[PDB]
């Protein structure tokens, strides 16, 4: 229902643009799909064989960009859909990349740290000729992180010389960008302010509910409350809390670092975790899992705005229900694009051999997301469509035009 | 399954199960978009692909198929089979298989050239004289290879060894037309010698009269073999005293087929495999020897010129009747061996005379039959299992030597 | 062109250049001709000769346009490549000079044949050009779409390389401000030259011949600074208004018609008399050779800004110098274009595009400095602006060449 | 001298498409590079190096490097094209090229010549290569020049002996290269004679020229029983109707300036050498020595063109009607280029051959070329010269067509 939603949205956008069927078919087929054998000796000496893979969906607008997932549940349709989605997302963000997605079918929880390094290095050896600073730039995803990127960078640099721009999400000490940690949450705050301004409103005074308090949710809550938003309820995997007068986010952040989660926070009451999405508020921010808003709770949402920080939190049934209630939904492909935008800035800084101060990273991020929202808004006016459809048509249109300009022979 | 021969071979060997799993997984699988402008200006998009199964023993080798019916399991099985066949042949290659999902009968010659060049552009960094050397297959031919060579050479400089099956004027090897049929004759003499016999005087039945069948008939009859019956798609003919192959060849060039040949009587095409003879050579399609006719085969030797003419049921039946079956993976390997010789000549920058091509082919197929026979003694198995056991073992030992990085 | 070698040899005289170094500077680094054969749309073969003269790379990668035009003259191509070497040095951008093209008639080729020809040409020269080797650009017969095709084909051989050509569409990495660049530079150089005479653009009365990319942008930006545009001409006719032509109003007219002809707010005039119109500043921005042995005595302008290439011939150079007319030479006056193409390459190399405000501020900085350096050479060698420009460029190339050495 | 007419006649005999013929005439690539060196006196000297790469449909290009002040572009292009046809006639997997430097080696010290050779190599190394373009000696260059090229090129690409031919034996030159052209002259003569039911043994030969080609041809022909009845060189002409003792003559010629004064032969008028009574005439010195004034009196039944262009078109017609069979130079002296192919092969294969193998392969190659040449003459009802050109043009055309023209 995320792979179905990507191809449904692409085809709806292609019809709004009047795309020729033969160009549409070209845009659907990935540039390249690669599967490689990754066999390593385990710590006990015996062999273990894994399949690594990389779908490189499109490079009309620049090098491909996308995460590397270490996860046993590999589905070819889902991986292809995610690589295709990144092609549209980078175009919406107006960063000079196409989309890719890769990974290894493995369970990292069953591998030692030494086996994970051996597997990462073998995988890099098997694909180093297929990726590259101006070809395809990987990033972390489920099951991988900054240490994984460090190993990819180190192994790749044996083959091509020191090449920090070959991956993003690196530790700061190896060329990671300042502002990366806050990037997605900060972009959520920027896009919310852009949307509210369009309705003559401002973050200050608005009441927020945030489901999820991880990298995205905690930064969004911190930065939104610093602009005067009142965060009246938050949840994570350990429980849900509420304070109608507003949760003290600095105190909550201090609580959550010392405990497993928001549960037990002194400055808020615990509440039914299944009630968080239907709490009275102005703005609802799903920032944990997808599929949480469906035909069953959609009629009970009280927010006027939904900011999709998580990927695919709303299904198509709830979209129609919420549209008819007058709820405005800022779509995920734009709302959480602060992360991929600052990953572009990381690559830029590495390419330029010179890192930026955090203020510059955040000022460029604001510039980029203001421009994307304006272009998204103009697409909606041009095609008389909602925000989700404006973002897909914007992204598809940019890729189609770059493809047409470059030609076919 | 199509893995049955491999899995049986891994058990005759003592193959560690984790190494066995590794040998099954292909080194690399690639799918690329191939989009071209058609003659009418509109776009056409195709998917090109290449399964690179194994390169422990050297560059990968395998055909390029232009055909609308792509089956991933079959492409993978054929690439894996090539890995074992090159090892049986003792040529320094692994296996690969590739193609484009397209229908060439619906594409103009200029569109086919454009598609071939775009496909080459999309894979040029994945193939190479010491990496992966393609060849013709269904839907492709020497002209296709010429276009691949020409486009590849724009990216890497002039590289004639990057494909085999090229036209002679572009570095193709002499003796390629006859190679598979000649190897069928070489392999038959090697098997017969082991039984204290020779081709001269033996009665052959040959099903199929194409590139393999006609060359085998011509060369076997020139060694004194009596070709008593032949068939093709147009009909079957018989002459108990021996068919005049030179006359039949002249007839087939002028009449589209063996049908109507003067000097042979016509027979039921469905009875050719059970004709009385010494040596049966299926050289047309696979699956023609099965559990329904196997008990009625009269030959003492079956030479598998075609790919998989005998199914496992017939193997069992024919073994207990005392019939010796020269397996396809060895018997028709003259083709892949001479394609190695083509690559060698290109690498050496100097072409061989046909006499040298044929002498080296005889040496290679004699030595490979010798090693296959020794494998059969070691493991007390038939020829087919000796061949798979030989090929898997060679790949396994090269893989173990190269290691995994510790 | 013996006129381009005349300015070079004079500059080599003024500097103390060793005669063997002078000979070296004349000889191009490389000259390449390649066969470009394509199937035509009707199936038959067509063969063209593509070429690239790479004149000098002492100061950095070579830079120069690609011309699709049937009338190829080897002398002219060499002269333009050499002139680009001095011009990049005058602008102080880290490039040398090159010039290339294909002898073909684009008006006789379909858009499909033109794409095929461009890709084949690229395949035939891809190993001879490159991001840090030689960076082509549009010229007569080519444009942004041509550069897109070169970029796309080149990238098959070397990976995505947006900095390999300049003049790209904005969507493929072209720079903001490229359209206005040459005209903006013409205006920048005019203000610098006037300030040296204690004057400002504001109030000066301009005649501009040509209303194309250079002329219309020059006319627009000069008028916004208070310049009085008293006469303008193009291929369709000439107009005059002693109080100044309303350029925003003229721009609306000229985009909806074939030209300035019929413009309300200006009276029509004889097209062949615009160059001798009473004014302070004359801006030839159309073709070359329009200032010659006979009209030199009747131009009323005290300043001539060479927006077009070589609008003044040596005979008029002699006449106007003795008449006290100041000529801002083409090699500096129109260098805004090549300077912003350098900025486009910089932005692609840096992986990050600039705002237009930054492009135009950098353009002002570069053209201010080159005018300052050019004026200093005129003092050192007691020469006119044209020789100050050539001595500045030749000297920069000579010093880089000497430092890099031989062996 | 450079009659390009043979090609056009061959293209019509083959019925070549007119657009394909035009493509075959246009060179793949023409390159001019600056070669500037410090001279021994410290000052700079600038030279122009060049390479015409005519065709590579059949494989890497092959051709000499000329150090000579008289560079003519039309001549260089014609020679590169001729090499394309000659390699095709010989059936060696090469196309044609020709290059050089405009310089006078007699005015350069050996240190300057080395510096110039290394600078030239640095300026073209990316344009040539073991599988791209393989240079060789020519006028003004020799084995030592090739050694310097090999050495400089190998700094950029690792040890690459196959990048040039004509190397000293110690750096990968082939055994049998010295005798190659003369031996090929002897092979082609025997092949031609067999077609007429004759053999070398007993035939009477007259040989003009006693250098690398003439002396080896004479030595090998007499060892096959040919009677060498008259020989000439730059010093004079000598005659012996019973046959000259070539081993004795060779020993005489190293101790003197020439065949003049040889004790085993009487001197003859040097202007009568071509009209001497014999069976086989072998011009092996200069071109143009057979023309309309001596043609009617040639006594030979066969003419073996060892030198380049010894018979002009006028004599071809005269001698054809007298029934004289002329073995054309493009084939007759191809032993040299064939053994240079064998040198490349040996270097590529990392393992040098014995002289016996070189000479056996040369016999195989030249026997086959003569058979293909003779068959072309039957197909197209033409003489030996046109059979050779149509054979070579046809091979290049067929390779070009097979490789195709898509992008
Ligand atoms: N981090 C980024 O830059 C980024 C960018 C794009 C999209 N996203 C999307 O954002 C979402 C969250 O990302 P993250 O990086 O913050 O993840 P994270 O792992 O840092 O945090 C996820 C949070 O959700 C909470 N959570 C998990 N399951 C829950 C449940 N059932 N109910 C309530 N809370 C639950 C966790 O406890 C945690 O607080 C995912 O859908 C992800 O795809 C993240
Ligand atoms: N040719 C090679 O180099 C090579 C290599 C490996 C394996 N093989 C195998 O050899 C077999 C034959 O290949 P080929 O190149 O000789 O083919 P081909 O197309 O040149 O000739 C095939 C012959 O089989 C006959 N035939 C076709 N269908 C028939 C039918 N239903 N009944 C009877 N006769 C029939 C045809 O009339 C023809 O005489 C194939 O199975 C192929 O996989 C060939
Ligand atoms: N455009 C640049 O960036 C640039 C840079 C360097 C040099 N130049 C030189 O500047 C000149 C003009 O370039 P452009 O880009 O403005 O050209 P353009 O194609 O934009 O048009 C120039 C204008 O001149 C007019 N014109 C043409 N012929 C005329 C004539 N005989 N009389 C009067 N008007 C005439 C045209 O109608 C048009 O209005 C050319 O010589 C060019 O090489 C331009
Ligand atoms: N050597 C080769 O490999 C080779 C290959 C192709 C073509 N050729 C052609 O062969 C011819 C000779 O080649 P070579 O290597 O033997 O040259 P060389 O310099 O070794 O010998 C030339 C000989 O001709 C004699 N000679 C010069 N001028 C003469 C004249 N006017 N009358 C009579 N004799 C005269 C000289 O004294 C000398 O004996 C030239 O046309 C050359 O282009 C040579
Ligand atoms: K695509
Ligand atoms: K494997
Ligand atoms: K120079
Ligand atoms: K050509």
For chain A, say whether C352 makes contact (Cβ under 8 Å).
yes
- H-helix or E-strand spanning residue D382: none
Rounded distance from Cα B45 to ligand 5 centre (Å): 9
Contact C230, C205 (CB under 8 A): yes
Which residue of C214, C270, C341, C363 sits with most ligand 3 atoms within 8 Å of its CB, as the best mutation to test the pocket? C214
For chain D, say whether B150 makes contact (Cβ under 8 Å).
yes
Contact D9, C14 (CB under 8 A): no
Q: HSE, CB side, 13 Å, CA atoms: give it for residue B84.
A: 29
Contact D78, D1 (CB under 8 A): no
Give the per-residue SS3 of D165-193: CCCCHHHCCCCCCCCHHHHHHHHHHHHHH
Distance in angstroms between the alpha carbons of the first and the last residue of chain B: 34
CATH class of B171-406: alpha beta
The DSSP secondary-structure symbol of B352 reads: P
DSSP string, D239-304: E-TT---HHHHHHHHHHSSSSTT-TTSEEE-GGGGGGSS-SEEEE-S-SS-B-TTTGGG---SEEE
Q: Kindly state the greatest CA–CA separation across chain D.
A: 68
Tell me the C-alpha to C-alpha distance, in Å, between residue B12 and each of B195, B329, B392, D263: 25, 18, 10, 85
Check C38 against D126: CB less than 8 A apart: no
The DSSP secondary-structure symbol of A106 reads: -
Contacts of D403 (CB under 8 A, 6+ apart): B146, B147, B149, B150, B170, D57
Q: Which of C152, C159, C169 sits opposite A134 (nearest CB)?
A: C159
Check C116 against D407: CB less than 8 A apart: yes
Closest CA to D341 of D363, D362, D357: D362
**CATH of the domain spanning D29-171, picked from 3.40.47.10, 1.10.10.10, 3.10.129.10, 3.40.50.10860:** 3.40.50.10860
The token duo for C199 is 């004057």
A243 lines ligand 1 (CB under 6 A): no
Strand order in the sheet with A207-211: A269-271, A239-242, A230-236, A207-211, A283-286, A305-307, A328-330
Question: Strands C45-54 and C96-102, how do they pair?
Answer: antiparallel
Rounded distance from Cα D209 to ligand 4 centre (Å): 6
Angle, helix C19-26 to helix C385-404, in steps of 10 degrees: 100
- Long-range (24+ apart) CB contacts under 8 A made by C194-197 are C194/C281, C194/C303, C196/C375, C197/C326
For tokens 């369709």, name the residue.
Answer: C236
For chain A, say whether B19 makes contact (Cβ under 8 Å).
yes
CA angle B157, B159, B164 (to 5 degrees): 155
Contact C384, C375 (CB under 8 A): no
Q: Which residues of C touch B41 (CB under 8 A)?
A: 112
Q: Which residues pair with D228 in a beta bridge?
A: D205
- If 0-12 CB within 10 Å is exposed, 13-18 middle and 19+ buried, where does residue D43 land? exposed
Resolution (A): 2.0
Query: Which candidate in D62, D91, D98, D227 is catalytic?
Result: D98
Closest residue (by CA) to atom 21 of ligand 4?
D211
> After which residues, if any, is chain D broken (C to N > 2.5 Å)?
none
DSSP string, B42-96: -EEEEEEEEEE---TTSSEEEEEEE-S---HHHHHHHHHHHHHHHHHHT-S-EEE
Q: Specify the CATH superfamily of domain C173-407.
A: NAD(P)-binding Rossmann-like Domain (3.40.50.720)
Neighbours of B274 (CB within 10 A): 17
The token duo for C256 is 């909806």
List ligand 2's pocket residues with C-beta within 6 A.
B 180, 207-213, 231-233, 283-286, 305-307, 332, 335
Contact B57, B93 (CB under 8 A): yes
- H-helix or E-strand spanning residue A131: none
Strand order in the sheet with C267-269: C267-269, C237-240, C228-234, C205-209, C281-284, C303-305, C326-328
Q: Which residues pair with A135 in a beta bridge?
A: none
Phi, psi values for residue B45, rounded to 5°: -115, 130
The DSSP secondary-structure symbol of B405 reads: -
Distance in angstroms between the alpha carbons of the first and the last residue of chain A: 37
CA angle B102, B107, B111 (to 5 degrees): 100
For tokens 């110039």, name the residue.
Answer: D116
The DSSP secondary-structure symbol of A101 reads: E
Check C30 against D30: CB less than 8 A apart: no
Q: Which residue of B has its CA nearest to C122?
A: B154
For chain B, say whether D260 makes contact (Cβ under 8 Å).
no
E runs forming strands in D310-404: 325-327
Tell me the C-alpha to C-alpha distance, in Å, between residue B94 and each of B31, B60, B133, B387, D199: 20, 4, 10, 16, 53
CA angle D150, D152, D155 (to 5 degrees): 105
Contact D187, D219 (CB under 8 A): no
Check A134 against C161: CB less than 8 A apart: yes
Domain ranges, ordered by start, for chain B: 28-170, 171-406
**Which ligand has the nearest atom to the CA of D34?**
7
d(CA A263, CA A269): 9
Q: Which residues of B touch A408 (CB under 8 A)?
A: 35-37, 43
**Could you give the dihedral angle defined by the CA atoms of residues A63, A67, A68 and A69, in that order, rounded to the nearest 10 degrees?**
-150
The token duo for A71 is 């996860």
Which residue of B233, B261, B289, B327 sits with most ligand 2 atoms within 8 Å of its CB, as the best mutation to test the pocket? B233
The token duo for C173 is 């990495």
Interface test with B, best of A19, A24, A33 (most B CBs within 10 A): A33
Coil vs helix vs strand at D308: coil
d(CA A101, CA A81): 9
CATH of domain D172-407: 3.40.50.720
Tell me the C-alpha to C-alpha distance, in Å, between residue C78 and each of A361, A385, C139, D33: 47, 57, 15, 14
Active site residues of C: 99
Rounded distance from Cα C384 to ligand 3 centre (Å): 25
Q: How many CB pairs under 8 A join B and C?
A: 8
Q: Which residues pair with D290 in a beta bridge?
A: D311
Contact B115, B43 (CB under 8 A): no
Contact C307, C219 (CB under 8 A): no
Q: HSE, CB side, 13 Å, CA atoms: give it for residue C388.
A: 21
CATH class of B28-170: alpha beta
For tokens 């002249």, name the residue.
Answer: B250
What distance lies between CA A48 and its chain's CA centroid? 32
The token duo for D69 is 């002040």
Q: Which of A347, A402, A406 sits opposite C351 (nearest CB)?
A: A347
Q: HSE, CB side, 13 Å, CA atoms: give it for residue D264.
A: 15
Q: Specify the CATH superfamily of domain A175-409.
A: NAD(P)-binding Rossmann-like Domain (3.40.50.720)
Contact A319, A329 (CB under 8 A): yes
- H-helix or E-strand spanning residue A40: strand A32-41
Distance in angstroms between the alpha carbons of the first and the last residue of chain C: 31
A236 lines ligand 1 (CB under 6 A): yes
Angle, helix D355-380 to helix D73-90, in steps of 10 degrees: 100
**Could you give the dihedral angle defined by the CA atoms of residues B53, B56, B57 and B59, in that order, rounded to the nearest 10 degrees?**
60
Give the per-residue SS3 of chain C: CHHHHHHHHHHHHHCCCCHHHHHHHHCCCEEEEEEEEEECCCCCEEEEEEEEEECCCCCCCEEEEEEECCCCCHHHHHHHHHHHHHHHHHHCCCCEEEEEEECCCHHHCCHHHHHHHHHHHHHHHHHHCECCCEEEEECCCCCHHHHHHHHHHHHHHHCCCHHHCCCCCHHHCCCCCCCCHHHHHHHHHHHHHHHHCCCCCCCCEEEEECCCHHHHHHHHHHHHCCCEEEEEEECCEEEECCCCCCHHHHHHHHHHCCCCCCCCCCEEECHHHHHHCCCCEEEECCCCCCECCCCHHHCCCCEEECCCCCCECHHHHHHHHHHCCEEECHHHHCCHHHHHHHHHHHHHHCCCCCCHHHHHHHHHHHHHHHHHHHHHHHHHHCCCHHHHHHHHHHHHHHHHHHHHCCC
Tell me the C-alpha to C-alpha distance, in Å, between residue C229 and each of B346, C211, C216, C265: 72, 12, 11, 12
For chain C, say whether A62 makes contact (Cβ under 8 Å).
yes
A288 lines ligand 1 (CB under 6 A): yes
Closest CA to A351 of A139, A133, A150: A133
d(CA A35, CA A126): 10
d(CA B383, CA A233): 75
d(CA A148, CA A166): 13
For chain D, say whether B110 makes contact (Cβ under 8 Å).
yes
* Protein residues with C-beta less than 5 angstroms from the ion ligand 8: C 35; D 23, 26
**Which ligand has the nearest atom to the CA of A400?**
5
Contact D265, D238 (CB under 8 A): yes
Active site residue A360: no
| Letter string b/e over residues B275-291, b meaning 16 or more CB atoms within 10 A of that residue's CB | bebbbbbbbbeeebbee
Quote the radius of gyration of chain D (alpha carbons, Å). 22
C233 lines ligand 3 (CB under 6 A): yes
Closest CA to D28 of D344, D337, D400: D400
Closest CA to B382 of B332, B336, B315, B287: B315
Phi, psi values for residue A323, rounded to 5°: -55, -45
Q: Which residues of D touch B348 (CB under 8 A)?
A: 345, 348-349
This structure was determined by X-ray
d(CA D355, CA D336): 14
- If 0-12 CB within 10 Å is exposed, 13-18 middle and 19+ buried, where does residue D150 land? buried
Neighbours of A248 (CB within 10 A): 17
Phi, psi values for residue C202, rounded to 5°: -60, 125
Tell me the C-alpha to C-alpha distance, in Å, between residue B234 and each of A311, B253, B281, C350: 63, 13, 18, 69
- H-helix or E-strand spanning residue D48: strand D44-53
Tell me the C-alpha to C-alpha distance, in Å, between residue D227 and each of C179, D197, D219, D221, D224: 83, 18, 10, 8, 9
The token duo for B64 is 């390029």
Contact A82, A139 (CB under 8 A): no
CATH of domain A32-174: 3.40.50.10860
Closest CA to B128 of B167, B168, B99, B155: B155
E runs forming strands in B283-330: 301-303, 324-326
- H-helix or E-strand spanning residue A270: strand A269-271
* Protein residues with C-beta less than 5 angstroms from the ion ligand 7: C 24, 27; D 34
For tokens 């040296």, name the residue.
Answer: C196
Rounded distance from Cα A75 to ligand 5 centre (Å): 20
d(CA C163, CA C149): 13
What chains are in contact with C, requiring at least 3 Cβ pairs below 8 Å? A, B, D
The token duo for C11 is 């500059």
For chain A, say whether C151 makes contact (Cβ under 8 Å).
yes
Q: How many CB pairs under 8 A join A and B?
A: 73
Check B27 against A37: CB less than 8 A apart: yes
Rounded distance from Cα C119 to ligand 5 centre (Å): 20
The DSSP secondary-structure symbol of D353 reads: P
Active site residues of B: 97
d(CA D217, CA D306): 9
d(CA C50, CA C142): 14
Contacts of B346 (CB under 8 A, 6+ apart): B129, B160, B161, B171
Closest CA to C304 of C391, C384, C190, C181: C190
d(CA A13, CA D42): 71
The token duo for C153 is 């084909």
CATH of domain C30-172: 3.40.50.10860
Closest residue (by CA) to atom 8 of ligand 3?
C308
For tokens 């040459």, name the residue.
Answer: C182
The token duo for D76 is 């260089």
For tokens 């229908």, name the residue.
Answer: B103
d(CA C66, CA C139): 5
What chains are in contact with D, requiring at least 3 Cβ pairs below 8 Å? B, C
Query: Do you know the residue count of chain A?
Result: 409
Coil vs helix vs strand at A49: strand
Coil vs helix vs strand at D142: coil
Closest residue (by CA) to atom 8 of ligand 2?
B306
d(CA D204, CA B133): 55
For chain D, say whether B170 makes contact (Cβ under 8 Å).
yes
For chain B, say whether D129 makes contact (Cβ under 8 Å).
yes
d(CA B326, CA B338): 20
Give the dihedral sign, CA B166/B172/B175/B180.
negative
CA angle D350, D353, D357 (to 5 degrees): 145
For chain D, say whether B165 makes contact (Cβ under 8 Å).
no
Q: Tell me if domain A32-174 and domain A175-409 are identical in fold.
A: yes
Query: Do you know the residue count of chain B?
Result: 406
Check A408 against B36: CB less than 8 A apart: yes
Q: Which of D56, D345, D398 sits opposite B158 (nearest CB)?
A: D56
Q: Which residues pair with D389 in a beta bridge?
A: none
DSSP string, D72-136: -HHHHHHHHHHHHHHHHHHT-S-EEEEEEE---GGGS-HHHHHHHHHHHHHHHGGG-BTTTEEEE
Neighbours of C25 (CB within 10 A): 22
- Long-range (24+ apart) CB contacts under 8 A made by D242-246 are D244/D218, D246/D215, D246/D218, D246/D219, D246/D222
Closest CA to B132 of B178, B105, B164: B164
d(CA B304, CA B327): 5
Check C29 against D33: CB less than 8 A apart: yes
d(CA A255, CA A264): 8
Q: Which residues pair with B232 in a beta bridge?
A: B235
The token duo for D199 is 């053999």
CA angle C204, C205, C210 (to 5 degrees): 125
């Amino acid at each position: 229902n995320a792979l179905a939603a990507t191809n449904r949205n692409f085809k709806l956008a292609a019809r709004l643009l009047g795309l020729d069927s033969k160009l549409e078919k070209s845009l659907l087929i990935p540039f390249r799909e690669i599967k490689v054998e990754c066999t390593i000796p385990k710590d006990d000496g015996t062999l273990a064989s894994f399949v690594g893979f990389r779908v490189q969906h499109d490079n009309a607008r620049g090098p491909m960009k996308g995460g590397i997932r270490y996860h046993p549940e590999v589905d070819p349709d889902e991986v292809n859909a995610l690589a295709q989605l990144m092609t549209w997302k980078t175009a919406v963000a107006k960063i000079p990349y196409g989309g890719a997605k890769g990974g290894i079918g493995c369970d990292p929880s069953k591998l030692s740290i030494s086996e994970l390094e051996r597997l990462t290095r073998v995988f890099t050896q098997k694909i180093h000729d297929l990726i590259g600073i101006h070809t395809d730039v990987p990033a972390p995803d489920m099951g991988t992180g900054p240490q994984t990127m460090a190993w990819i960078l180190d192994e790749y640099s044996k083959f091509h010389g020191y090449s920090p721009a070959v991956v993003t999400g690196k530790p700061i000490d190896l060329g990671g960008s300042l502002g990366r940690d806050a990037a997605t949450g900060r972009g959520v705050m920027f896009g919310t302010e852009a949307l509210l301004n369009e309705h003559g409103k401002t973050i200050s005074g608005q009441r927020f509910v945030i489901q999820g308090f991880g990298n995205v949710g905690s930064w969004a809550a911190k930065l939104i409350s610093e602009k005067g938003g009142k965060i009246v309820a938050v949840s994570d995997i350990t429980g849900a809390i509420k304070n109608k007068d507003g949760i003290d986010i600095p105190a909550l952040l201090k609580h959550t670092k010392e405990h497993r989660g928001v549960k037990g926070f002194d400055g808020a009451d615990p509440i039914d975790p299944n009630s968080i999405l239907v709490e009275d508020c102005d703005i609802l921010v799903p920032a944990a899992l997808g599929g949480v808003i469906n035909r069953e709770n959609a009629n009970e949402i009280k927010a006027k705005f939904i900011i999709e920080a998580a990927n695919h939190p709303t299904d198509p049934d709830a979209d129609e229900i919420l549209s008819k209630k007058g709820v405005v939904i800022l779509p995920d492909i734009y709302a959480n694009s602060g992360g991929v935008t600052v990953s572009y800035f990381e690559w830029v800084q590495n390419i330029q051999g010179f890192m930026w101060e955090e203020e510059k990273v955040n000022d460029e991020l604001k510039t980029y997301m203001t421009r994307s929202f304006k272009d998204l808004k103009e697409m909606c006016k041009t095609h008389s469509c909602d925000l989700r459809m404006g973002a897909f048509t914007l992204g598809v249109n940019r890729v189609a035009q770059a493809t047409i300009l470059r030609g076919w022979g």
